[PDB]
Amino acid sequence: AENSVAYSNNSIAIPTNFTISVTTEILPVSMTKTSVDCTMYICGDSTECS
Amino acid sequence: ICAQKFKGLTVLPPLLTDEMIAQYTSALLAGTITSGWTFGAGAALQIPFA
Amino acid sequence: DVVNHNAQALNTLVKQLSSKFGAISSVLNDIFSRLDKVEAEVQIDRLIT
């Protein structure tokens, strides 16, 4: 939405009230810990492929 | 999930369980409520919330 | 998204084992049973790579 601030040489706006807002901020910290067995993944139960 | 376990792809559990993370957040909440910022700089100093 | 990416990468890594990579078969034992050691090694080197 377009706004136009009424700037002037002698004009100030001072709030006469307030409000208390509570917002939510969400942050990832960690992810899934995986582990890979190389021999069991590549060949798998095969001695000559190992 | 069992197909990944059969293929050498395992998932390790985290070291800190969710009960322990909840105990950390409980300690931080109790310190923030009952001491303000004073427990971050050293020993906690009690102060009324007002 | 942190859950979904780590599930999706593992599903892709599991599903990639059905690929042939230019070999005659994606099954490891079928190349050993159907071919002798002269060309079974060069067919399974593609799978290993």
Next chain:
Amino acid sequence: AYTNSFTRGVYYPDKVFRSSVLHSTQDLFLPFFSNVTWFHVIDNPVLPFNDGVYFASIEKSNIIRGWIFGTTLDSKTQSLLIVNNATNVVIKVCEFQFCNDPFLDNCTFEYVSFKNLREFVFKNIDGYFKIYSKHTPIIVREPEDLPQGFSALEPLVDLPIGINITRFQTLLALHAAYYVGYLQPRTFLLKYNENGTITDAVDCALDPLSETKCT
């Protein structure tokens, strides 16, 4: 007389059991919402076979009795004849035409083994004949076209004949309507439940939404 197929003609493409999985396959399937040809029972004109035929029949009690397949149908080359009877079912590949008009009264291979809706798929791969079937009846509210719904067709017949087929014709009972459609090479997404039964399918080339579903 033309009508519209409604998500029908999906068969089991292989003998592999799969449980609770979406599988994408490339095979000769009847396309979804295709245009099939509809005939009444008086007639059996001779129709081409192409790459495969989806046959369907809605009939009272054994109005449809068999099929004739061939290329020239002039007693020079082999013509596959299937006749089903209340006694026993006969399949032959005898070349010679027996009736002047085919009706219900040295062969290389012989094999002896609106209340009713029957679906069949006949196809050939390198001359090897595959017949898939499904027999589920409809009791009430017959609308004289293809019923809206999904069903899977299980394989029944595999013939190692090597016989070229290009045209075909059906057989009627003598002393109801039937449907014919053609199979095209399509990519299908198939849904398998815990039993292993195909419960849903998506034609990847029907529209951009199903292409997105297949992607």
Next chain:
Amino acid sequence: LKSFTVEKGIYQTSNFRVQPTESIVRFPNITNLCPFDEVFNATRFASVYAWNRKRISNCVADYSVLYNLAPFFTFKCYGVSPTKLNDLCFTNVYADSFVIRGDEVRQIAPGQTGNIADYNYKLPDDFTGCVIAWNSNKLDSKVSGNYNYLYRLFRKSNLKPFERDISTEIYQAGNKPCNGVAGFNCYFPLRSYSFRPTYGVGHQPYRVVVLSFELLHAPATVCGPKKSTNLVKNKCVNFNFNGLKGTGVLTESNKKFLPFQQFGRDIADTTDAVRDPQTLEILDITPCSFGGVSVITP
């Protein structure tokens, strides 16, 4: 870790433990020895361009005849090794047994262009199976020419691969209509090479059998000569189901197979459930070797 000194911590160790295997074999119990003598020891072979194909379904394909007898020259197998044909199983075997000139025996290969390679022996691009040849000086060579074999040529059109057909119509080499009557540039289809014993060794006739196998591990009715032993369960064993080899613990399974279904496959399209070819029970395959353990040490 490839080191003699291990620091304090927890380490994931790959398995160096040796797991012995026990071979378990399971095959269909058909007892009929295969009539290869109907293909080989027949008095007269079939017509070359009629594509008379012999079907092998209920057999025990013993290849000791193929390897321990004198008249065998080439074993050109595509998609399978001839030295391991006695260990596998096949669904249906098909035989094309015709007699070709010896110098044209090299033309029996997919992707080749020739009079033999384009018209009768047109193997497809995905062909699997063997080509076998041997000499026929005693049987297929006659004085003043042998006329038991007729050959088709003089056309610029190539037929479809593995489509049996008979072309009794005259091959229209010329633009004029032959209509079954010999005329200008109209050649009859069947031509005799007239094999003689006085010809050269390359021009001597050769008996050639092309065996086409289906190498799938489907319900198989053709198997090589091998016993079937006891089914060991709940232990790390090898297994050999219809030529399908594998290693793993075979256990009882509750996967309700459809009556036409043979195999069960996993997410990675690996074989997880099998059906016994004799007892028709369903078995689940579990991997043998544990992948690795963790070692907690100071």
